[model samples]
Target chain A: DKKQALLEAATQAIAQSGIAASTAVIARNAGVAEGTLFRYFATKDELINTLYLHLRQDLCQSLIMELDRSITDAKMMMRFIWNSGISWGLNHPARHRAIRQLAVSEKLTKETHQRDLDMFPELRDILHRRVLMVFMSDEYRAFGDGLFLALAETTMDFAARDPARAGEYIALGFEAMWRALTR
Target chain B: DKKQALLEAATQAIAQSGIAASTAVIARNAGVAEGTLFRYFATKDELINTLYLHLRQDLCQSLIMELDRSITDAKMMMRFIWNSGISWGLNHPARHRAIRQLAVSEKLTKETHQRDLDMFPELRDILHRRVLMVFMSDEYRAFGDGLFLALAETTMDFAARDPARAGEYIALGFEAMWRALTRE
Candidate 1:
C-alpha cells in the first residue's frame, strides 16, 4: 500500500514537474517518510520504472477487459481501440502523462518495452500481420514521438495567426484522426 | 555567425541532454574554446535565452513576411499559418524541438517569455486565451496533457501494429490536424 501510495504521489508530482520532480515531494504527498520511499524504491530510476510499468499494466488490463470479446468486426474493433484510448487518456490525465514521460524520455529498457507489448496477444498478432485475435478482428492493418514537438510547433503556428481557431483544430483534429484511423 | 553557431550547438546539446548540457559540450560542438563561449554569451542563461528568442524571432518574422496582409479572410489566414508551422517543423525538426524544450522546461523567465510573445501580437492573443492552441481547446479542456498522451499512445499503438504504415500517419495525421484547425 505504501508503494502504491508513492506511485500515485510520484505520478502526480512528475506529471506536474516532469522528471525534475523530487522524491521528497513525492514521499510527502504519499504520506510516508522520505526514507520509506528509498526502502521501496532504491533510486529515482527504480521509482520511475516501477511507476511506468504499473500504470501500463493497469492500462493494458483495462483495454482487455473493456473491449468486447464477441466483436470480431474490424471497423468495430478499430473504433473501440481508438475511442477507448482517447477516452482513457482524457479521463486519467496525470497517469497518462506519467506513462508517456517514461516512454518518450527513453527511460524504459528494451526488456520493459518488449514486455509492454508482449502482454497484448492480439496486438501481437496485429504486429505480426497474422489473423486477428478472437477478441477482435480488424480488416485494417493499423500502423501508427519526436515528431510530436514538430506537431506541437506546427499547431502553435496555426494558433499564432488566429488564436480563436485553436478550438477548431482541437475539436476537428480529433474527428479527423478518428475518421482516418477507423474509416 | 559565431552567435548562430553557438545557438545551434546549444540547441543540439540541450535537446539531446536536457537543460544540464555543459557549456563545454556546446562550445566543442561549435568548434570554439569553452572560454570563448563566455565571450559571446555572458552566461549560460544568456546563451539559452538568446537562442530561444532568436528562433522565435526568426519564426515570427517569417509569419509576418510570408503572410499576405491583404488576405483578410480569417479562414485563409488560418490555412496559411497552418502550412507555415507544419512546413517549418518538417524542415527543422531539431530546431522545432529545441524551441519547444526552451519553452516547456522553464528555461525562460517571465520577462523572457513575455518578450518572446511580444514579437507576434496575434500569437500573443492566441496564447492569452490559453486553451485555444491544441487539444486543450475542447470541452474536455480538463483532459489537458491527457489529450496529448492519448495521441502519442494511440499513434504508437498503431505504429507498432503496422510498421510499414508508420510513415503513413504523419501526413494523414497532419492533414487531419490541419483541416481541423482551419475549419469553422
Candidate 2:
C-alpha cells in the first residue's frame, strides 16, 4: 500500500519537475521518510520505471475500458478509441505529462516499449486490426501511428484551451482523421 | 565574419547538445576566443536569440525563394512550399534540430516571435492568404498551421527513411493534407 503511495507521489513530482524529480521531494509528498522510499524502490530509477509501467497500463486500460464490442464500423471504433484517449489525457494531465517526459527520456529502456506492447494484447489487437485495414505497409503503419498521435495531441491542445467548444473540436478532429486515414 | 561563424558553430553545438551547450566549446568550434563571442553577443542568451532569429529568417526565406508566380493552383503553391521546407530540413538537419530546441526554450523572448512575423511580411502573407482561403477562424488558422507542420515533419521523417520512395511518400502526404483541409 505504501509502495502504491510512493508511486503516486512520484508521478505528481515527475509531472511538475520532469524526470529529475528527487526522491526527497517525492518522499515528503508521500508523507514517508526518504529512507523508506528506498526500501520500496532501491533507487530513483526503479521508482521511475515502475511509475512508467503503471501509467502505461493505466492508460491502455482506459482506452478500451468501455469499448463497444458490437461496433463494426471502423470509423466508429476509431472514434471511440480517440475519444477515450483524449478523455484520459484531459482527466489525468499529470499522468499524461509524466508519461510524455518519460517517453523521451533515455531512462526508458528499449524493452520497456516492447514490454508495454506485449502487456496489452487486446488493446494492440483492437488498434492493429483497424489500422491494418487501410494502411498495409509496416513502415506506413508506423508513420500512421506517429501522425495520429501528432494530430490527437494537437486536438487535445485546442480542446483544452476552449472547453466550451471541446465537443466541436473533438468531432472535427475525428472527421479530419477519418478522412486522412481512409483508403 | 566571426559573428556568423560563431552562430553556425552554436547551431551545430545546440543540435548535438541541448541549449545547455557551453560557450567555450562554441567559441573553440568557431576558432575564436570565448571572450570574442561576448564581443558579438553580450551573453550566451544573446547568441542564442540571434541564432534563433538567423535560423528563422533562413528557413522562411527558403520556403518561398523559388517563386513560380505563374502557378495559379493553390495546391501547387502549397506543394512547392512543402517541398522547399522538407528539402531545407533534410539538407540542414542541424539547423532544423537547433531551431526546434530553441523554439521551446524560455530563453527566446516574446518579442522574438512577433518580430519574426513582422520581418517576414511576404512570407507571412503567402502563408496567411492561402490558409485563410480554406480555414476562416483565427483559432482554426492557428490549428491549421500546427497540423500542417506536424504532418510535414512526419512526411519528412518517412521521406528521409525511405529515400527510394521519397517522392511517393511526399505525394501521399500532400494528398492526405489536401483531403483533410478541403471545405467540401
Query: Which is the leading candidate under TM-score?
Result: 2
Tens-digit per-residue lDDT, B30-113, candidate 1:
999989999999999888888888877876776777777677555456446545654565456567656665654445665676
Q: What TM-scores result for chain A when each predicted structure is judged separately against the true chain A? A: 0.67, 0.74
Query: For model 2, how does the per-residue alpha-carbon lDDT over A1-183 read when each residue is reduced to its tens digit?
Result: 888888889999998897889999999889999999999988877787778889988987887676787886767877887788889988898887787656544465546655776666655564556543534353355456556655676678768977787887787777766667664
DockQ score, prediction 1: 0.11
Candidate 1's docking class is: incorrect
Return the DockQ of model 2. Answer: 0.47
The CAPRI quality class of candidate 2 comes to acceptable
Q: Write the per-residue lDDT of candidate 1 for residues A33-99, one digit (tens) a residue.
A: 9999999988888787778778878777777878888888654564465445544555676777777
What is the Cα-based lDDT of residue B26 in candidate 1?
95
